[PDB]
Amino acid sequence: DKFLSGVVEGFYGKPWSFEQRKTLFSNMAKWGLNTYMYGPKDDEKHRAAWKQAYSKREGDSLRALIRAAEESGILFIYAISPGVDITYSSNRDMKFLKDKLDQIRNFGCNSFAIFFDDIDFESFAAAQVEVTNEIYKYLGMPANFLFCPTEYCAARADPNVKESKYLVTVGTGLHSDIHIMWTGPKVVSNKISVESILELQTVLRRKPVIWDNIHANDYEQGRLNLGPYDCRPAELMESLNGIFTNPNCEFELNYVPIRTFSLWCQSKRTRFNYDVEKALEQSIREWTEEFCIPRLLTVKDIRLLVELFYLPQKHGKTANDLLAQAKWLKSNFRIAALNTDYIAAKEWDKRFSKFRSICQIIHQFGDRLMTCRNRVLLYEVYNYVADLCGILYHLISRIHSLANPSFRYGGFVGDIHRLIVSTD
Amino acid sequence: DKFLSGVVEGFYGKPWSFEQRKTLFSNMAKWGLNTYMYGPKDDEKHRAAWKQAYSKREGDSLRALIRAAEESGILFIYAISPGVDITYSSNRDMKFLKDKLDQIRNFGCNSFAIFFDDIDFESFAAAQVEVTNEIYKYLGMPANFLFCPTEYCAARADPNVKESKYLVTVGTGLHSDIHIMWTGPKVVSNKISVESILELQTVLRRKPVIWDNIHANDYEQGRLNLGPYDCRPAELMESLNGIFTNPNCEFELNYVPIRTFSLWCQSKRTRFNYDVEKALEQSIREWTEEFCIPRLLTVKDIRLLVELFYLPQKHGKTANDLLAQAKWLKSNFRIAALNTDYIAAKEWDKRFSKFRSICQIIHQFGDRLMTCRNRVLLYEVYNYVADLCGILYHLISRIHSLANPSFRYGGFVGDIHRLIVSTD
């Protein structure tokens, strides 16, 4: 039990394929991080079909996945969410849990993760502690046994944030060799700090394991998190028993965030210094080297793509420059189509022609990305660039319509978005 | 040369697989429409690599695709876009065009479609007419030879809309057995009429073929067009030489628009009456019958899904009801948290609880759709429902925050969207 630094499949919608998970395991071996939790929402065998057992074909597929993870040199953690209605009462569903963990142990893996409310009331705390301790005693002593609480973030703890008493019950009543999952101050989890982890270490009397969601994208329309691993210090890695991350739903776009997270873990095993921009440019150089592979573009344009679709907490340099220029063209547009007023209109036309040149070069980047060698990495990235070029052309057309003397975009989702931004 | 009613691949990004095109051909055989134009943007052999030839493996794949279309009972039209810089001048690139059409004729197909500006200046009209007539004379007399002009819509004709003189040059100079592509009054092409097609038949002195884009979705973020085929009369089908349609980028979502278009063509071959709602409920019943297939939910919830992601020209009944209720809750929110004012606040709370019940039942529809048998049709539809549930919960949270005493969504695309809706 050294450190459980890995990548989960806690996102919704996409099942990653067997070769995608195999290349993920080989990337895990060559990068340094040594864990992989298996919680896919497409696989409903561990979520609601745990009363049922595993079949022959999907059992052999999971056995091949487990032995592929074993031969790659990483470890496999099977996350099963039966629900918070066990309470050790009837023990028929506890027998179903024991038979399910027996057949997963027959499939090859020995590490588990009991989930009650999966990270995306009352009188359940001591019952879930008893259920988790009886399951952990039934499996003897597994080396890496995880447990996700119902109040996995400070926004979900309803009595205050220090002592909601559910965290103190699962801190005192559970066995000391079981890890507790956590997310941070928020479920979306932007700008986390070591003080919340320190008071959680005070409450839980053990080091937790941070399920992170700084690269997750299932909760927003068109969000892509190709940004680096930022706003987490090295001492946050120091005061834990491991830290997982939830990447994007599309696998081939997750080269740069998993590589910056691998820098953030494996270089910090030796020395606690971390440069975000150096790891970002190293990951983007390795991503251009992976971009040239013809699996069925210079570094500057892919730097522009990474700096556009950044983290949810902060945009990139180019994105902030475009938002500042769009705000400047939107604010002082009354001097348009009109000595000092005429040169101010010429300055406004200079800024607007700079904006048109930015949309033209990002459309040329879209065509040059369309002429790529890799195609399965092309399709996962093309929709974001195409919709960005469309909304940037709509922005430029709106500014040009406001220059000289409705708007439907996004369908119903964009209609709801415009209905909650526009005021009375 | 009866009628070229078919489905194109003119969308961007997605290459449809061989089995997807095979099931598309079997659906084409069992529904009635008998054409398929091949213009995929992922295949750059016909767009810029037409100087190069076809390889052995992709040539055998195209030969298998052509013979699969032949054995299904439909016909195959190969669309090639060399560019508008031919002008019959050097004839080396004309020899490249002749060798490319020779190897496509060796692959099996005999129908073609010369494109100059693909539907998504000056002094080119008589040169492109000469190039198209020399190519059509080189191929003898193909039965179905198509030609897409540069000014394919009335919004692209720069001198007026009746006589831009490019349309009159390609109407008089071309051979009378060549069809001319058209889109309508707009490239996006909503609410088209028979009068524009009548004046185009006056100008072009032949019946055109309408490339339609009423179900296209590559040009907007999160747009899904699961709506029926609407706002096109039967006499529009009467005064043509065929009509194609551009469906969505995801293949398995295109059951209902291609089935309503198949109703709109094949039932109108016998009688020109068309019910939009009867064809919509027949296509949604056949889509539930296809929904139950376990290829790796009652009719009311899939009716709710189709009525949500409707056409770009008009929303459904449920979507208009939700927008009207959101506008009503947004408009008179000042009576909230406050005799007549108190019962008005209770009426406001009744409408807000109705809105919360609508978001709850659409999240339950999301979970019940997640428990489906088909998975490759699950993943193509899950992202739209998940982002709709997220933006509806954000709408309800904003209305509840406005009830009793920034906003980041979409990333950079949503930032541009909020920057072009919000005013000074």
Answer for the pair B82, B148: CB distance below 8 angstroms, yes or no.
no
Answer for the pair B2, B35: CB distance below 8 angstroms, yes or no.
no
Residues near B214 by Cβ (< 8 Å), separated by ≥ 6?
B189, B190, B225, B229, B230, B231, B232, B245, B311, B312, B313
- CA end-to-end distance (rounded Å), chain A: 58
A with B: how many residue pairs have Cβ under 8 Å apart? 181
What CATH number does the domain containing B125 carry?
A: 3.20.20.80
Q: Assign 3-class secondary structure to chain B.
A: CCCCCEECCCCCCCCCCHHHHHHHHHHHHHHCCCEEEECCCCCCCCCCCCCCCCCHHHHHHHHHHHHHHHHHCCEEEEEECCCCCCCCCCCHHHHHHHHHHHHHHHHCCCEEEEECCCCCCCCCHHHHHHHHHHHHHHCCCCCCEEEECCCCECCCCCCCCCCCCHHHHHHHCCCCCCEEEECECCCCCCCCCHHHHHHHHHHHCCCCEEEECCCCCCCCCCCCCCCCCCCCCHHHHHCCCCEEECCCCCCCCCHHHHHHHHHHHHCCCCCCCCCHHHHHHHHHHHHHHHHCCCCCCCHHHHHHHHHHCCCCCCCCHHHHHHHHHHHHHHHCHHHCCCCHHHHHHHHHHHHHHHHHHHHHHHHHHHHHHHCCCCCHHHHHHHHHHHHHHHHHHHHHHHHHHHHCCCCCCCCHHHHHHHHHHCCC
B175: tokens are 């051979």
Q: Taking CB atoms and an 8 Å cutoff, what residues of chain B touch A377?
A: none
Compute the nearest-CA separation of A56 from chain B (Å): 16
Phi, psi of A115, rounded to the nearest 5 degrees? -120, 140
Burial tier of B353 (Cβ tally within 10 Å: 0-12, 13-18, 19+) = exposed
Same domain (yes/no): A124, A256: yes
Same domain (yes/no): B114, B224: yes
CA distance B249 to B46: 19
Kindly list the distances between the CA atom of residue A224 and the CA atoms of A384, A390, B129, B365, in Å, as whole numbers in the listed order: 8, 16, 45, 25
Phi, psi of A102, rounded to the nearest 5 degrees? -65, -40
Compute the nearest-CA separation of B240 from chain A (Å): 30
Q: Which of A409, A415, A424 to mutate to test the interface with B (most CBs of B within 10 A)?
A: A409
Same domain (yes/no): B184, B332: no
Kindly list the distances between the CA atom of residue A123 and the CA atoms of A85, A129, A173, A182, in Å, as whole numbers in the listed order: 11, 11, 14, 21
Residue B297: CB atoms within 10 Å: 15
The helix (H) or strand (E) run that includes residue A75 is strand A75-80
Q: Taking CB atoms and an 8 Å cutoff, what residues of chain A touch B41?
A: 370
Residue A235: CB atoms within 10 Å: 14
In a domain, A287, yes or no: no
The helix (H) or strand (E) run that includes residue A80 is strand A75-80
Q: Taking CB atoms and an 8 Å cutoff, what residues of chain A touch B323?
A: 412, 415-416, 419
Using the structure block, give the residue that is written with the tokens 């559970």. A174
B80 forms beta bridges with B114
In a domain, B163, yes or no: yes
- CA end-to-end distance (rounded Å), chain B: 58
The helix (H) or strand (E) run that includes residue A200 is helix A194-204
Using the structure block, give the residue that is written with the tokens 């919360």. B356
Same domain (yes/no): A262, A325: no
Of the candidates A219, A322, A387, which has its C-beta nearest B390's C-beta?
A: A219
For residues A219-229, one letter each, b for 16 or more C-beta atoms within 10 angstroms of the residue's C-beta and e for the rest, the string is bbbbbbbbbbb
Q: Which residue is catalytic, options A85, A93, A118, A341?
A: A118
Answer for the pair A171, A202: CB distance below 8 angstroms, yes or no.
no
A264: tokens are 């953030």
Same domain (yes/no): A308, A267: no
CA distance B177 to B1: 10
Same domain (yes/no): A29, A156: yes
Q: Which residue is catalytic, options B43, B85, B102, B118?
A: B118
Cross-chain residue pair B418–A416, CB shorter than 8 Å = no
Compute the nearest-CA separation of B307 from chain A (Å): 10
For residues B270-293, one letter each, b for 16 or more C-beta atoms within 10 angstroms of the residue's C-beta and e for the rest, the string is eeeebeeeebbebbbeebeeebee
Q: Taking CB atoms and an 8 Å cutoff, what residues of chain A touch B395?
A: 416, 419-420
Long-range contacts of A271-278, Cβ-Cβ distance < 8 Å, separation of 24 or more: A272/A234, A272/A235, A272/A238, A273/A234, A274/A234, A276/A228, A276/A229, A276/A230, A277/A228
Q: Taking CB atoms and an 8 Å cutoff, what residues of chain B touch A370?
A: 12, 41, 44
In a domain, B293, yes or no: no
Answer for the pair B226, B257: CB distance below 8 angstroms, yes or no.
yes
Cross-chain residue pair A417–B398, CB shorter than 8 Å = no
Of the candidates B41, B383, B417, which has its C-beta nearest A370's C-beta?
A: B41
CA distance B385 to B327: 22
Closest CA to B188 of B217, B229, B164, B162: B217
Same domain (yes/no): A234, A314: no
Answer for the pair B398, A420: CB distance below 8 angstroms, yes or no.
yes
Mark out the alpha helices in A32-179 (DSSP H runs). 56-72, 92-107, 125-138, 166-172
Phi, psi of A249, rounded to the nearest 5 degrees? -70, -25
In a domain, B198, yes or no: yes
Same domain (yes/no): B197, B96: yes
Using the structure block, give the residue that is written with the tokens 């409450």. A203
CA distance A112 to A144: 7
Same domain (yes/no): A17, A129: yes
In a domain, B203, yes or no: yes
Task: Mark the breaks in chain A: residue after which each occurs, C to N over 2.5 Å.
Answer: 120, 296, 338, 405
Quick one: angle between helices A317-331 and A376-403, nearest 10? Answer: 20
Same domain (yes/no): B311, B268: no
A173: tokens are 């009543």
Q: Which of A378, A416, A424 to mutate to test the interface with B (most CBs of B within 10 A)?
A: A416
CA distance A168 to A203: 6
Answer for the pair B152, B164: CB distance below 8 angstroms, yes or no.
no
Closest CA to A215 of A229, A235, A197: A229
Using the structure block, give the residue that is written with the tokens 């190897």. B103
Answer for the pair B193, B182: CB distance below 8 angstroms, yes or no.
no
CA distance B259 to B239: 22
Kindly list the distances between the CA atom of residue B208 and the CA atoms of A379, B162, B242, B402, in Å, as whole numbers in the listed order: 33, 15, 8, 54
Kindly list the distances between the CA atom of residue A355 and the CA atoms of A364, A375, B370, in Å, as whole numbers in the listed order: 14, 30, 42
B37 forms beta bridges with B77
Sign of CA dihedral A107, A112, A117, A119: negative
Would you give the DSSP letter of residue A336?
Answer: T
Phi, psi of A163, rounded to the nearest 5 degrees? -125, 95
Answer for the pair A118, A148: CB distance below 8 angstroms, yes or no.
yes
CA distance A116 to A114: 7
CA distance B153 to B187: 6
Q: Taking CB atoms and an 8 Å cutoff, what residues of chain A touch B412?
A: 308-310, 315, 319, 322-323, 388
Quick one: angle between helices A340-370 and A376-403, nearest 10? Answer: 160
In a domain, B313, yes or no: yes
CA distance B298 to B285: 9
In a domain, B417, yes or no: no
The helix (H) or strand (E) run that includes residue A329 is helix A317-331
In a domain, B295, yes or no: no
Max alpha carbon distance in chain A (Å)? 87
Sign of CA dihedral B160, B165, B166, B168: positive
Cross-chain residue pair B412–A319, CB shorter than 8 Å = yes
Q: Which of A374, A401, A417 to mutate to test the interface with B (most CBs of B within 10 A)?
A: A417
Same domain (yes/no): B73, B23: yes
**Catalytic site includes residue B60:** no
Using the structure block, give the residue that is written with the tokens 């290459």. B15
CA distance B21 to B43: 15
Cross-chain residue pair B379–A14, CB shorter than 8 Å = yes
Cross-chain residue pair A420–B407, CB shorter than 8 Å = yes
Same domain (yes/no): B96, B237: yes
Residue B101: CB atoms within 10 Å: 21
Using the structure block, give the residue that is written with the tokens 């296509």. B283
CA distance B46 to B48: 6
CA distance A403 to A63: 64
How many structural domains does chain B have? 2
Burial tier of A259 (Cβ tally within 10 Å: 0-12, 13-18, 19+) = buried
Domain extent, residue B148, equals 6-274
Quick one: angle between helices A276-291 and A255-266, nearest 10? Answer: 140
Q: Minimal Cα distance from B333: which residue of A? A: A424
